[PDB]
């Protein structure tokens, strides 16, 4: 998201130790740093052509994706730059020889490289503790609209 007007905070939002020189007259007007996150996750074109900063991005920020790689379905995109996904699974009760449905809500951080809404399947990767509860970071969006644009008006 990030709601462009990117310099929206009281500090100047910049990437650390990325210098773009005022003397050398570069006709791209800003240097950007972006990285490959590893594990075959393709860095999106919104992370290279984007002009946000987002120091917890998996591609343009200082976090590294290492540990578990989970997936989930998105149930809350109301916080700024962090969503909450649902992760449902089955718990085997060994006495009754059968299962029960369980779920867990995981809050993950979502870069402004992706646009996520409620219902989309995301793949997230474990990173360092981002906030009090955020330990994961969106590395793949596996849905775009979940058939939203295919519901227009009549003829």
């Amino acid at each position: 998201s990030t709601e462009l007007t990117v310099q929206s905070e009281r500090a100047f939002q910049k990437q650390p130790h990325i210098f773009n020189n005022p003397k050398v007259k570069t006709s791209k007007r800003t240097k950007r740093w972006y990285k490959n996150a590893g594990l075959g996750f393709k860095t999106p074109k919104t992370a290279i052509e984007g002009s946000y900063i987002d120091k917890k991005c998996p591609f343009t920020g200082l976090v590294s994706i290492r540990g578990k790689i989970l997936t989930g379905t998105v149930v809350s995109t109301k916080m700024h730059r962090t969503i909450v996904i649902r992760r449902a699974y089955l718990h085997y009760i060994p006495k009754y020889n059968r299962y029960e449905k369980r779920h867990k809500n995981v809050p993950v951080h979502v870069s402004p490289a992706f646009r996520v809404q409620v219902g989309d399947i995301v793949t997230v990767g474990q990173c360092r503790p981002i906030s009090k509860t955020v330990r994961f970071n969106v590395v793949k969006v596996s849905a775009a609209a979940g058939k939203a644009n295919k519901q227009f008006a009549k003829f």
Binding site: Q7, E9, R10, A11, F12, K14, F19, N20, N21, P22, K23, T30, P107, K132, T133
Partner: protein, 188 residues
Amino acid sequence: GISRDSRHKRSATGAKRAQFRKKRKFELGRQPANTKIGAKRIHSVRTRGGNKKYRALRIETGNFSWASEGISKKTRIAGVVYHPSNNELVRTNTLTKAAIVQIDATPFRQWFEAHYGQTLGKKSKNAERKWAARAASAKIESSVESQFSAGRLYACISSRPGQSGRCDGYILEGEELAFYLRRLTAKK
């Protein structure tokens, strides 16, 4: 003492954590530096593993780096002009990281007149070939040149003075300078 654990601090369900173990030495916190300007005072705090930290408080000289010229000079600090976290640290002149200060503009001016010789604002043999080779390195800026007229440059702190005992920074240039100038002008 100060703790920095999450053994207090209600869980994500909003439940109050029951009180587990007594306060731990390895979850310690300490009091802020609140560095002022003038009359260098630095105390040493014994951290974990020995490994002393240098709690600066009231320091006055810094090592500021003119980034587009490649140099670093030791200069005075005049005062804190802007702070993105708290305006109180602007009011009481407390130096932390990311503060915006006014430094000295004298050794950078003297270096620029030794390196290019152009008298910001407004003889012998080898520096003649030198100042031939430059110039196309001496067209610096409008907005950074015009501060040298005032005898004070805007700068940012980049060292954490409470942990390092230094107030080192760089000099504001380009869009960062335009951003902080838009901040400083439209509050006065």
